[PDB]
Amino acid sequence: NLQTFELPTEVTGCAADISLGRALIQAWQKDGIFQIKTDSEQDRKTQEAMAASKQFCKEPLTFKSSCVSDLTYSGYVASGEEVTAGKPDFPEIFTVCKDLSVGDQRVKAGWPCHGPVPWPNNTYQKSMKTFMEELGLAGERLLKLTALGFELPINTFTDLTRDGWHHMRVLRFPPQTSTLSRGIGAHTDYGLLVIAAQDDVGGLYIRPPVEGEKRNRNWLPGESSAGMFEHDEPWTFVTPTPGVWTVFPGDILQFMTGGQLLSTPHKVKLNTRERFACAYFHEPNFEASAYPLFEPSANERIHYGEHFTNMFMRCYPDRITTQRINKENRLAHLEDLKKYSDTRATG
Ligand SMILES: NC(=[NH2+])NCCC[C@H](N)C(N)=O
Ligand SMILES: O=C(O)CCC(=O)C(=O)O
Ligand SMILES: [Mn+2]
Numbered sequence: 001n002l003q004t005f006e007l008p009t010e011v012t013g014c015a016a017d018i019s020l021g022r023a024l025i026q027a028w029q030k031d032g033i034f035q036i037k038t039d040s041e042q043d044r045k046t047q048e049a050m051a052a053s054k055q056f057c058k059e060p061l062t063f064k065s066s067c068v069s070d071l072t073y074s075g076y077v078a079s080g081e082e083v084t085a086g087k088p089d090f091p092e093i094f095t096v097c098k099d100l101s102v103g104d105q106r107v108k109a110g111w112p113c114h115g116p117v118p119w120p121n122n123t124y125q126k127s128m129k130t131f132m133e134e135l136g137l138a139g140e141r142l143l144k145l146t147a148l149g150f151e152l153p154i155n156t157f158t159d160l161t162r163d164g165w166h167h168m169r170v171l172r173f174p175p176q177t178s179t180l181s182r183g184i185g186a187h188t189d190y191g192l193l194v195i196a197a198q199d200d201v202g203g204l205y206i207r208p209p210v211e212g213e214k215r216n217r218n219w220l221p222g223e224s225s226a227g228m229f230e231h232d233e234p235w236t237f238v239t240p241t242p243g244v245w246t247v248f249p250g251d252i253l254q255f256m257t258g259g260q261l262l263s264t265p266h267k268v269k270l271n272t273r274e275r276f277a278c279a280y281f282h283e284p285n286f287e288a289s290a291y292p293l294f295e296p297s298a299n300e301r302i303h304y305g306e307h308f309t310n311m312f313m314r315c316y317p318d319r320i321t322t323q324r325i326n327k328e329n330r331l332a333h334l335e336d337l338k339k340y341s342d343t344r345a346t347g
Contacts, residue, residue: 003027004035004244011144013154021149024142025261028249031236032208032264035244036138036195043243045131046197049170050276052127056120057092057172064092064120070320071107071115072097073312074167079174082315084185085227090270091183094120094170096128111337112309112330113286113321128170132280135195135245136166139282142193142247150257152293157192157256160290163345165191165283165308173203173277176270183268183275188218188225189250190311191283191304194264196246198238201275205235206248207265215262218251219302221310225251229265250281252290255302260294283308287337287345306334 005024011017027034038046056064061078068075077093099117100107106114119125143157173183183203198204207229216223238246248264268277284290286305292298309331313322325331341347 002031002033002035002238002246004037006037007138007141007145009141011141011148011154013144013148017145018148021145021147023149024145024247025149028261028264029209032262033206033236033238033246033248035241035246036142038243038245042134042138042245045127045134046245046278048127049131049278050197050199052124053094053170053172053276053278056094056124059120067094067118067120068320069115069118070324071102072100072113072117073316073319073321074099074115074117076118077316081319082184083317084187084315085224085230087182087185087227089182089184090180091171091173091268093172095167096132096170097167098165099129106343109337110328110330110333111286112325112334113305113312128168131278132166132168135168135280136164136282138195138245139166139193139280142195143282146253150260150293156293160284160288160304161192161282163285165286165304166281167283168278168280171275171277171279173268173270173275175272175274181269183270185227186225186230186265186267187227188254188263188265189279189281190218190252190307191250191281192252193282194246194248194250195280195282196277198240198277199275200240201271201273202237202240203268203271203275204238204246204277205267205269206238207235209262210234215254215259217255218263219255219307224314225263225265226314230267235267250283251307252284252302252304255300256290256293258292258294285345287341287343289346303338309334
């Protein structure tokens with residue numbers, strides 16, 4: 001039975017906010033996840049996104065597959081195209097990353113992963129942008145509350161999310177048609193928070209913290225979390241519930257908190273009906289470096305954009321986006337922009 005919280009519209013640092021932050025942390029530490037109650041506008045925007053997704057997925061595969069970019073990972077992923085732990089995943093996906101035209105300086109400079117979303121049409125665009133604006137407001141509330149719960153300055157995490165690399169996976173899982181029930185293999189997501197919505201069908205499972213269990217640090221190339229614990233209990237079924245979004249930590253929160261929070265492992269099983277879901281990632285700025293909050297003498301850092309880029313390359317080894325990164329050596333520029341950027345987001 002997951003906890004459900006209603007968040008205040010604004011987080012100011014009053015005693016109630018600090019208390020709520022404590023409760024959110026405790027719920028993550030016990031269950032790995034909690035629910036936040038949605039209001040009528042949050043719910044309306046969620047349902048309109050789900051409807052736009054259903055309409056897009058009915059389009060011919062050739063059209064859907066045309067919604068791709070060799071500059072950004074935004075756009076369509078066919079069923080069986082994404083790889084997790086060396087195995088194909090089943091959903092068809094539309095990924096929405098920061099929507100930057102070729103007029104944006106970062107795109108002109110060839111920064112990896114920067115470019116325009118290949119929207120299927122302008123009504124889908126509007127529905128997703130409106131939904132993501134609402135999701136971002138919730139992400140910011142959550143980050144202020146989390147800082148307060150850890151007795152940190154209220155802006156500790158939001159100082160890293162200005163022009164944050166927020167993105168979303170808009171998913172349709174097919175019904176199970178073969179002996180394979182795997183929708184998406186076990187994995188952790190990459191940023192600060194994951195805020196997710198699902199329809200009535202059901203299929204998401206999450207792994208709570210387990211006392212004494214070692215957790216891989218998925219930001220390290222020798223400790224990928226993909227596939228870990230796939231067939232070992234415990235896995236908590238996330239029961240579809242009207243009027244909520246779920247929230248769990250990603251890799252950056254695990255790193256920054258030194259494991260006081262864990263990036264929640266999760267997986268999806270195919271059901272007897274198709275299943276629509278949306279997973280939103282509230283992320284640092286592409287140029288931000290995460291740091292350990294509770295060990296100021298520690299030298300380890302995560303350059304967020306580098307983590308994102310490495311992850312998407314491992315998800316999509318053969319996508320035109322990955323090919324162009326390799327061809328133009330755009331990972332090198334990612335090392336360069338660490339020291340010669342002009343965006344003023346850092347330094
Ligand atoms: N958040 C994503 N882009 N994908 C989530 C699934 C796991 C991913 N294929 C992996 N190997 O980490
Ligand atoms: O299908 C879901 O409910 C979550 C999917 C997910 O974890 C992802 O797309 O990263
Ligand atoms: Mn995920």
